[PDB]
């Protein structure tokens, strides 16, 4: 499956940064989409397209004539508006449907003690939950099969940057005599949750 | 601006003096591939991704050369108006729950990076290090500036302190991460 | 690849030409036909999309099958002036091109 | 237009032989392509802008260089018979809809 590109336009005639990109904003699959390309000369956008306005406009006074002229040539301007669906719809359909979309990862999910174990004195467990995607994930604390909301932190999602995901529970808890801790975790690539427990 | 999802599909980056340019596709913030603009190749950060999908990097070295002459105008159109240089910040996390013996990975995440010109480097006990170290390309922010990370495999050991040392235009001195 | 027949043809004068193109890559989405005189380099003579079925200009029309990633180069009304060397191409994601070999076509009076 | 030069050239096996192409299109993509019988328009080199080539279909035995926008080269190093063709040159705008071709240049290799 092939991956298509948006195509950056010519510009008309101690250090500088340029950057252009096509963005494709994807709702309900491709049920509605929506497109934008953007021109940047050291972090300020000069120059945009946007399907929801089906044409080139400047954003600052540097981009005022690359969008006249852009506009006014019928093949430049009709292969950035093409692009919606030759880049986008193509794209998400095509390349992502077969890698992306359909990327599920389970979580491994272990809980570690954070000060050497002792009865009635306050302590913490740590739920880690590492190596999953995709992004959405339910965490939660059972103390003896009730929910725990208090004393509980979790971490924002992390990004690890190699396409998983990781988020690590913290409980404050005092351990007692035969009660047991669980970690209850749900995620799309789990047929039913992963529960682990911590016996005191 | 809302949607279930974005794809980025050519982010392309050239910056003077120098002639460094970059060209990455990302979905949902995460990085589909780079091409390398030296051996001509699309590189995908998921082998298996490559297995399926595929990519001309002929379209990314096109649309680098539209992006250098780009910049040409846009520098002489502008009176040479230069980039400000930004503070970068680093933060430091391990892949896995860390366990004492184990192999592990380090991650470096620095953000705020701009121009995307960077140094980043380990060290172990304020020693360099570089044991299976790998970094990601840039990837882009919502205000135009980059973030990047590095990883650093290790085993973890009390004796054992780590710093991600970090140099950029924007610091007047090298920053230290600690973990 | 691009594949086009036959590799050489004539044609009575006021006889419509049809000259056939075929192509392997099904991402293919930009196919311009380019004439070329003798002597002269080729130049652009007609194209079209893969969105589109037919594309009409005066005497000549390309027919467009996707489905069966075949094209077709009629030429109406054929003139002595038509003879030629006809040259299919085809281009993905507006990268370069890839020439088809060919057709030669001889206009009898 | 574009400007091929020389238009017709004979040389000798083992000969070094430039081929170059001038436009004035303001065009930044141009190419180079031989054409041969029963092989068509085949593309051996071509260039986005100055400093930088790549590879056609059958860059073998060739090398390309753009010093300049305006000026793309083929050069042949060490010349040999089956190099003897017609070789055009061609310019383009970016992603563009139209190659614009020069009118030949007849080169003939001989042992």
């Known amino acids: 499956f092939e991956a298509q590109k948006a195509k950056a336009n010519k510009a008309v005639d101690r250090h500088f940064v340029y950057q252009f990109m096509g963005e494709c904003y994807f709702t309900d699959g491709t049920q509605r989409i929506r497109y934008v390309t953007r021109y940047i000369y050291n972090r300020e956008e000069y120059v945009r397209y946007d399907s929801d306005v089906g044409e080139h406009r400047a954003v600052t006074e540097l981009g005022r004539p690359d969008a006249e002229y852009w506009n006014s040539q019928p093949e430049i301007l009709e292969r950035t508006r093409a692009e919606l669906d030759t880049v986008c719809r193509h794209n998400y359909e095509g390349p992502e449907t077969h890698t992306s979309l359909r990327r599920l990862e389970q979580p491994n999910v272990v809980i570690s003690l954070s000060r050497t174990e002792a009865l009635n004195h306050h302590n913490t467990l740590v739920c880690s939950v590492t190596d999953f995607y995709p992004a959405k994930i339910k965490v939660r604390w059972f103390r003896n099969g009730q929910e725990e909301t208090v004393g509980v932190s979790s971490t924002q999602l992390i990004r690890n940057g190699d396409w998983t995901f990781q988020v690590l529970v913290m409980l404050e808890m005092t351990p007692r005599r035969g009660e047991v801790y669980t970690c209850h975790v749900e995620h799309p690539s789990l047929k039913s949750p992963i529960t682990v427990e911590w016996r005191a | 601006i809302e949607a279930d999802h974005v794809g980025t599909y050519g982010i392309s980056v050239y910056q003077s003096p120098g002639d460094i340019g970059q060209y990455t596709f990302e979905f949902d913030g995460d990085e589909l591939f780079y091409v390398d603009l030296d051996k001509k190749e699309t590189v995908w950060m998921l082998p298996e991704f490559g297995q399926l999908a595929s990519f001309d990097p002929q379209g990314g070295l096109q649309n680098i050369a539209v992006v250098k002459h780009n910049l040409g105008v846009l520098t002489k159109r502008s009176n040479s108006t230069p980039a400000t240089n930004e503070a970068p910040q680093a933060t430091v996390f391990p892949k896995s729950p860390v366990l004492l013996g184990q192999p592990n990975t380090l991650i470096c995440f620095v953000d705020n990076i701009f121009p995307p010109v960077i140094n980043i480097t380990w060290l172990r006990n304020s020693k360099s290090v570089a044991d299976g170290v790998y970094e990601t390309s840039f990837f882009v922010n919502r205000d135009y500036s980059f973030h990047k990370l590095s990883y650093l495999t290790f085993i973890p050991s009390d004796d054992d302190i780590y710093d991600c040392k970090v140099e950029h235009w924007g610091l007047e001195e090298p920053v230290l991460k600690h973990w | 690849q691009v594949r086009q027949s036959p590799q050489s043809l004539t044609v009575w004068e006021g006889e419509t030409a049809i000259l056939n193109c075929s192509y392997e890559?099904?991402?293919?989405?930009?196919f311009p036909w380019y004439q070329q005189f003798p002597g002269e380099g080729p130049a652009l003579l007609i194209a079209?999309?893969?969105?589109?079925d037919k594309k009409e200009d005066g005497r000549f029309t390309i027919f467009f099958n996707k489905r069966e990633k075949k094209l077709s180069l009629h030429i109406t009304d054929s003139q002595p002036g038509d003879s030629a060397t006809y040259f299919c191409?085809?281009?993905?994601?507006?990268?370069?091109?890839?020439f088809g070999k060919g057709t030669q076509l001889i206009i009898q009076p | 237009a574009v400007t091929q030069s020389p238009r017709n050239k004979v040389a000798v096996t083992g000969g070094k032989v430039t081929l170059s192409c001038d436009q004035t299109?303001?065009?930044?993509?141009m190419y180079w392509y031989r054409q041969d019988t029963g092989h068509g328009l085949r593309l051996i080199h071509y260039?986005?802008?100055?400093?930088?080539?790549e590879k056609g279909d059958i860059p073998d035995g060739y090398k390309a260089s753009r010093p300049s926008q305006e000026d793309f080269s083929l050069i042949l190093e060490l010349a040999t018979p089956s190099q003897t063709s017609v070789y055009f040159c061609?310019?383009?705008?970016?992603?563009?809809?139209?190659?614009?071709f020069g009118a030949g240049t007849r080169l003939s290799v001989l042992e």
């Open positions: 079209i999309r893969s969105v589109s």
């Open positions: 890559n099904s991402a293919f989405d930009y």
């Open positions: 260039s986005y802008g100055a400093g930088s080539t």
């Open positions: 191409a085809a281009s993905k994601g507006a990268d370069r091109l890839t």
């Open positions: 299109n303001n065009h930044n993509n």
């Open positions: 061609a310019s383009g705008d970016f992603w563009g809809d139209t190659l614009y």
